[PDB]
From a paper:
Human protein E6AP/UBE3A, the founding member of the HECT-type ubiquitin ligase family, was originally identified as an associated partner of the viral oncoprotein E6 of human papillomaviruses (HPVs). The E6 oncoprotein from high-risk HPV types hijacks the ligase activity of the host E6AP to ubiquitinate the tumor suppressor p5313, leading to the aberrant p53 degradation. Here, by using cryogenic electronic microscopy, we reveal that the structures of full-length E6AP and E6AP/E6 complex are monomer and dimer of E6AP/E6 protomer, respectively.
After several rounds of 3D classification, we identified five distinct conformational states of the E6AP/E6 complex and resolved the structures of these five conformations at resolutions ranging from 2.6 to 4.4 Å. In all three Att conformations, the catalytic C-lobe of E6AP attaches to E6, whereas, in the two Det conformations, there are no interactions between the C-lobe and E6. We hereafter refer to the three Att conformations as Att1, Att2 and Att3 based on the distance between the tips of the two towers in a descending sequence: 74 Å in Att1, 71 Å in Att2, and 66 Å in Att3. Following the same nomenclature, the Det two conformations are referred to as Det1 (76 Å) and Det2 (61 Å). As the two towers underwent an outwards rotation, the Det2 conformation transformed into the Det1 conformation. Accompanying the E6AP/E6 complex conformational changes, there is substantial variation in the spatial relationship between the E6 from one protomer and the catalytic C-lobe of E6AP of the other protomer: far away (Det1), close (Det2), or in contact (Att). Unlike the N-lobe of E6AP, which is restricted by strong interactions with its N-terminal region, the C-lobe in the Det conformation is free to move around and accept ubiquitin from an E2; this is evident in the overlay structure of the HECT/E2–ubiquitin complex presented in Supplementary Fig. 14a.
Residue numbers in the entry:
A (entry chain D), D (entry chain B): 9 to 149
B (entry chain C), C (entry chain A): 120 to 168, 231 to 562, 570 to 831, 834 to 851, 854 to 868
């Protein structure tokens, strides 16, 4: 919980060392310090979100502050926006070999979701040097 | 005999043009037929072969040819048909991946000195530039590094090639906002072609890849933003940095590293593009690349000093529009109070001591909010004149941070400041806050100050504009002949005056008393002492000035758009003065219009005075004697006719002037209020 | 002899065309020369003279002429040149202010029966309509009141004149969103011309200016909005009302007052305009009149039932977008919590008793918030199926508000409700909340219910569709011959069944026992008893139903856009059923696409079933068996392919259906869940 | 203060009967019940605003709630928007003979301000049957 290599970084890495299932893991947020919701509980594994240690405490996020602060970083630290083609010519790497997350839900953007952006010519977003996208759960109206 | 299928323009074709100029009688189509396959795609891959091109051939081949008249019409029409179906030779065929040989068809066509004739620009030349603008990255890199060995006039007439095209294109079309300028592909191309010429002058001119600063410690962001990188696990890796042009990355060079080019950078500007272009969506093309439109801010050298701030004004506004939109969200969902401004509580007795604990609170607590718009408040009683209250309060010798040199009429960072880095933080911050809010200051800094901020240190070359009486006394060492140990008594240790008045002995070497200077380490004495006063006597103070400057304009593209000469006209303003543009940049608020008399009374009372006293007036309307950078009407005048005897109400921010509903009824008291 | 300068087309010109048809040999240009000055501006002011026109002349003048062939080409070309320079005869000259005589040049040109030939529509006819559409108000008023004396087929072929033009104009151009439809002036004109034809059928048909309702008590607004009228002092004067067309004001008539026109209103629709027009900015043209664009919602009769809700959906959304924007402002500056929805707490045992104290709280406390979007919540556990939970719970005989008549298969307001006006408020509110949120209901109301809501009472004519067994038993009195005092024992007092079962004796007269009915006051017995059950037995209950309906759709233009027949397809939905439009109104969410098999499995299992069981399916996807009003794909289907054994997740609101990544692997349990 | 004809309706009608100048009139808002600001004090005369009587109390407005609630009525009760020409043909009256106020500051729209709308073709706003405009103090940026 102090040294980086002993404390686990993800909930799949945690839940055995912290002796639980995916369901009955006991966690508190970093902003709200609340018992996380069960849809929120499962996503922190799946969206591959990473454990904060405030004062040696493994913290997670709640979703409504997760989508909030990602919108904050979107509004506050926005560098440029790029086509899906324009990474493979300028970063010069496959996008499935690239850790691009969602700009809203912060799940890593899917190999088919990235090909929508080359199909429908939709642009990515660069913030803080990191890359972001729009996931399929974040594509309803 | 005719040599059709084999490679053209060779020395064999030199003897063929010479022997077909032999017996000139009735020879009308034969020269264009023996130069037509020069105008072919694959026939210049093969002909004339970090490259495989013979420049020693062709620049004497064209010389032998010009004893005639019709060949420039004959050279033209082949290249009209060359250029589209060779544009897709790299757009679709992608031949640079297939060979490094391919570039030769540009250079042979380029070296025609009859390209100076403007008849190519009907259709022919720009699409030759378009594929040359559609070259890939390392294809451009070797091409530019091929042009790192040119003479200046070869670059000049090659620069004057594309500039004459963008001379031609503005007088071609009437561009509008439905008549967009980034959708026209040739000016996109030729400037991107000129970018290589502009990047030729980087790598062709003076290069210093070495004396960069300490890498600027990018500010710690707020506790919310630090959290999310720990939530995203990217606290390991750092930022990839600002806006960066890929040709800077492809050549590995920076334009900041360029001391002097072949021909200076300020010649490389298109001026008539700037006066017709709106950067309102060109900046939208800058942050958001688009399909059929490209940003001219990615070719910033084409813009003058008039224009590059005009997008930087638009850049700060979208960072201010968003920082408006952020505290919208905090009062909505967090319920934390709407703070839409950089409010600034001061007292005129203590504004340095006010804004130090004010800004360094926001420079510590929430580092984001400095990007909100500036709003100055005194006790009892604005933001434009606020800087004037700071500038001489900072550039006072009596405040203990700077010295004034009377001959050069510029300031300099005094290195004799003890525990004054806190007050050195603010002058960085207020320098950003002037720029970020786009205000003009009355500042006399040497260009090395602007040179050191962008990321390149002070050299021997920057020493003269700082203080030449030192700079002459070290070049006179280098412009001497004698055995300078027996002639000169100079060792590495010096005498540097404290403001107590006592010069302090400083061994610039590890033992400057124990090693003396000879003819050879006279270079080494400069390379310690040229960097001494300029960089490393004030190094803790300058970085605390740099840290103040950095955390205001880090996210701005100021480092991208600008050179240290251009900062001088950007933070220090301009010394020109217009009024015909002033009287047309005034919408009739209040009721008063231009042709009625009390509009021209301001004009005539300043035109009675000399320039400095018109600036004594315009200190009241703009904010200072220093004009806005470049043009004068870029800030609009604002008239107000609202209901006299006293002095008119006149602001510096909204540029207002109150007016009662004759010519000489108020001007004595008005000029009195001006010269108070 | 030739009669050139004097007035044309007169009886003198009748003998001149007859004597120039005498001796027909080589008479090619003389008939068009003796009809050319008919095609003149001021020459029809003077010729042929609440009007001064001779209709008895011209409708026999054209009859005498048609023994030839070229005159319809001869009539045409003069009117091409007439129509622009006569359009500015009222646009600029403004001649209706100068005379009432002027209108005669339209009617003479209009009565040509060879206008039925479509060769006018190249340029000629529409600009004749444009000045006729540019007529002033009282100029149109007398013109329409001139057309209040037509026959139907004269109106029909005059209706078919402009409809054939708007038949011609849609097949003329491909209209888009950069290819706008309101900037084309002729369809603006011809529909505005057809509006007069549409308003001819109002004043030409059945008129009842009398039996309007009690004027609907517009709701008391909130305490903030009441305050501002006291702050603006306008608490004296009342509102000027809704959207009102000025021709309604100019003629003084309302289309609601029209029982039956000449030819019914539903024939007066252009259908191909609707399928190419987007009301997204046509509604922006409705609330905001523009320069070169005019709103088709100001000609609502041209739209079918398919289209008039599609703007009313857009109308509610801008009232919902603003009511989103309002509670944005309250949480910002007032700090009162974001309430962006009409949240609706219910328990399925008590949803009437839940939503009564729920809505009447918002119907009392803040009457504004009913215009926020509906959002239904149960305890424990949506808004589209919520109405189905209300409808039979309101249209139950066991809830005590309505009776069902089995023969007519429609409901009726039961007047035997004692202290049930509170529950009668909600059925008004939920009728608005269905409309305002654009939802469909399974409601069987007589059209008199919709007729009475708009502002016109129930007549003898509305009695049959309500309950004919009463309605036949009063028309059979009127279709009788006998001395109905000695024949029939009927006096004014009746017997009206309470739900106890006992008929209650009600003297409809002041003393219905003491005065009997004769042949003459048999009319008077209807005019008491036709209004008795329909209007004034349920009058306190209907107004409490009206008050519930009014405070939801008062600010909506529902009264403006719609007739009581059109409400029936608007609140009650449609009974058609499409699926080819369903499979193309489905964007591929989740991953499943159309040509893969499990898309057509829904299609084939409903196409195996008969129509009612496909509606048993579409109760799950849309919300009910009742289709959306008009078309079926106006709500889109939504597919979802997300990761089976159980029943698919399928909503009514967002129209979703979950799908695992064969044809007959789930259909038995799927149809089981459908028919549960 | 109860009967309409005895209590004055405007501050010029009030200040003598309520024994003051335009400056030292003592007033409370209808929303905030505060001592009105002196720019706000003077405008309630000039913008011809009308005295509310809550429980027999002559109330005025404060400006920041005046501009607020006028924006509320703008957003909540907006009927249609009309050209400056379109009143003189449909209301058929001169606009200086017509009480059109400001949509923001609620001063009655000036005879020259209304001719801007026929000059620069700018549209009025109808709300609650009342008419509104944009005054010249409410035309700065
Ligand atoms: Zn949280
Ligand atoms: Zn997402
Ligand atoms: Zn107030
Ligand atoms: Zn105003």
């Amino acid at each position: 919980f102090q040294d980086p290599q002993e404390r686990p970084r993800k909930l799949p890495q945690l839940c055995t060392e912290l002796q639980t299932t995916i369901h009955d893991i006991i966690l508190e947020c970093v902003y709200c310090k609340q018992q996380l919701l069960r849809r929120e509980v499962y996503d922190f594994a799946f969206r591959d979100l990473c454990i904060v240690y405030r004062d040696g405490n493994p913290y997670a996020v709640c979703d409504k502050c997760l989508k909030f602060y990602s919108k904050i970083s979107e509004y506050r630290h926005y560098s440029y926006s790029l086509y899906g083609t324009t990474l493979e010519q300028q970063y010069n790497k496959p996008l499935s070999d690239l850790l691009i997350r969602c700009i809203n839900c912060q799940k890593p953007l899917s190999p088919e979701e990235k090909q929508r952006h080359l199909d429908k010519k939709q642009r990515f977003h660069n913030i803080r040097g990191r890359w972001t996208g729009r996931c399929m759960s974040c594509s309803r109206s | 005999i005719d040599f059709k299928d084999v490679t053209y323009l060779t020395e064999e074709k030199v003897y063929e043009i010479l022997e077909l100029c032999r017996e000139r009688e009735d020879y009308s189509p034969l020269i264009r037929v023996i130069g037509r396959v020069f105008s072919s795609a694959e026939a210049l891959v093969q002909s004339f072969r970090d490259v495989s091109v013979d420049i020693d051939a062709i620049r004497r081949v064209y010389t032998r040819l010009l004893s005639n008249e019709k060949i420039e019409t004959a050279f033209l029409n082949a290249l009209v048909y060359l250029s589209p179906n060779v544009e897709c030779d790299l757009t679709y065929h992608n031949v640079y991946s297939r060979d490094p040989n391919y570039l030769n068809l540009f250079i042979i066509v380029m070296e025609n000195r009859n390209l100076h004739s403007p008849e190519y620009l009907e259709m022919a030349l720009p699409l030759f530039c378009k594929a040359m603008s559609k070259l890939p990255l390392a294809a451009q890199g070797k091409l530019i590094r091929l042009w790192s060995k040119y003479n200046a006039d070869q670059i000049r007439r090659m620069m004057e090639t594309f500039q004459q095209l963008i001379t031609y294109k503005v007088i071609s079309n009437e561009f509008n906002s439905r008549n967009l300028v980034n959708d026209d592909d040739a000016i996109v191309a030729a400037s991107k072609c000129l970018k290589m010429v502009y990047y030729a002058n980087v790598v062709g001119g003076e290069v210093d890849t070495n004396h960069n600063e300490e890498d600027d410690e990018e500010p710690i962001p707020e506790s919310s933003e630090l959290t999310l990188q720990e939530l995203l696990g990217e606290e390991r890796r750092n930022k990839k940095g600002p806006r960066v042009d890929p040709l800077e990355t492809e050549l590995g060079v920076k334009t900041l590293d360029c001391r002097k080019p072949l021909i200076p950078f300020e010649e490389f500007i298109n001026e008539p593009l700037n006066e017709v272009l709106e950067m309102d969506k060109d900046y939208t093309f800058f942050k958001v690349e688009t399909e059929n439109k490209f940003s001219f801010m990615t070719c910033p050298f084409i813009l003058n000093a008039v224009t590059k701030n005009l997008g930087l004004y638009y850049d700060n506004r979208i960072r201010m529009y968003s920082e408006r939109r952020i505290t919208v969200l905090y009062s909505l969902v967090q319920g934390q109070q709407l703070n839409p401004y950089l409010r600034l509580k001061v007292r005129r007795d203590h504004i340095i001591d006010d804004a130090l604990v004010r800004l360094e609170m926001i420079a510590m607590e929430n580092p984001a909010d400095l990007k909100k718009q500036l709003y100055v408040e005194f006790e009892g009683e604005v933001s434009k004149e606020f800087f004037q209250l700071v500038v001489e309060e900072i550039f006072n010798p009596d405040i203990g941070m700077f010295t004034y040199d009377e001959s050069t009429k510029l300031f300099w960072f005094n290195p004799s400041s003890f525990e004054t880095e806190g007050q050195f933080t603010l002058i960085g911050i207020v320098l950003g806050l002037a720029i970020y809010n786009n205000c003009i200051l009355d500042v006399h800094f040497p260009m090395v100050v602007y040179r050191k901020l962008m990321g390149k240190k002070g050299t021997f070359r920057d020493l003269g504009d700082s203080h030449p009486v030192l700079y002459q006394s070290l070049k006179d060492l280098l412009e001497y002949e004698g055995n300078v140990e027996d002639d000169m008594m100079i060792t590495f240790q010096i005498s540097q005056t404290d403001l107590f008045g006592n010069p302090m002995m400083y061994d610039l070497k590890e033992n400057g008393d124990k090693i003396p200077i000879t003819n050879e380490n006279r270079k080494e004495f400069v390379n310690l002492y040229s960097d001494y006063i300029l960089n490393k006597s004030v190094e803790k103070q300058f970085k605390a000035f740099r840290r103040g400057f950095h955390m205001v304009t880090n996210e701005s593209p100021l480092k991208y758009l600008f050179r240290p000469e251009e900062i001088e006209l950007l933070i220090c303003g301009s010394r020109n003065l217009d009024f015909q543009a002033l009287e047309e940049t005034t919408e009739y608020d209040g009721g008063y219009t231009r042709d009625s008399v009390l509009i021209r009374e301001f004009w005539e009372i300043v035109h009675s005075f000399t320039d400095e006293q018109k600036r004594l007036f315009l200190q009241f309307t703009t904010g200072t004697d220093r004009a806005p950078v470049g043009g004068l009407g870029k800030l609009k005048m604002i008239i107000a006719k609202n209901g006299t005897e006293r002095l008119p109400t006149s602001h510096t921010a909204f540029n207002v002037l109150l007016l009662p509903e004759s010519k000489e009824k108020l001007k004595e008291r008005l000029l009195k209020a001006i010269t108070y």
